[PDB]
């Protein structure tokens, strides 16, 4: 998974902690 501030889709939450929607970031 990703980490806080890692580039990802707002409706993906691919981050470990789940966050994505920071304008294309976790």
UniProtKB/Swiss-Prot annotation:
The chain holds residues 46 to 71 of 72 of the full protein. Keywords: Amidation, Calcium channel impairing toxin, Disulfide bond, Ion channel impairing toxin, Knottin, Neurotoxin, Presynaptic neurotoxin, Secreted, Signal, Toxin, Voltage-gated calcium channel impairing toxin. It comes from Conus striatus (Striated cone). It is found in: Secreted. This is Omega-conotoxin SVIB. Expressed by the venom duct. Its main location: secreted. Disulfide bonds join 1-16, 8-20, 15-26. The presence of a 'disulfide through disulfide knot' structurally defines this protein as a knottin. The modification Cysteine amide is found at residue 26. Belongs to the conotoxin O1 superfamily. One of its GO terms (cellular component) is host cell presynaptic membrane. Omega-conotoxins act at presynaptic membranes, they bind and block voltage-gated calcium channels (Cav). This toxin blocks N-, P- and Q-type calcium channels. GO terms for molecular function: calcium channel regulator activity; ion channel inhibitor activity; toxin activity.
């Amino acid at each position: 998974c990703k980490l806080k501030g890692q580039s990802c889709r707002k409706t993906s939450y691919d981050c470990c902690s789940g966050s994505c929607g920071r304008s294309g970031k976790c």
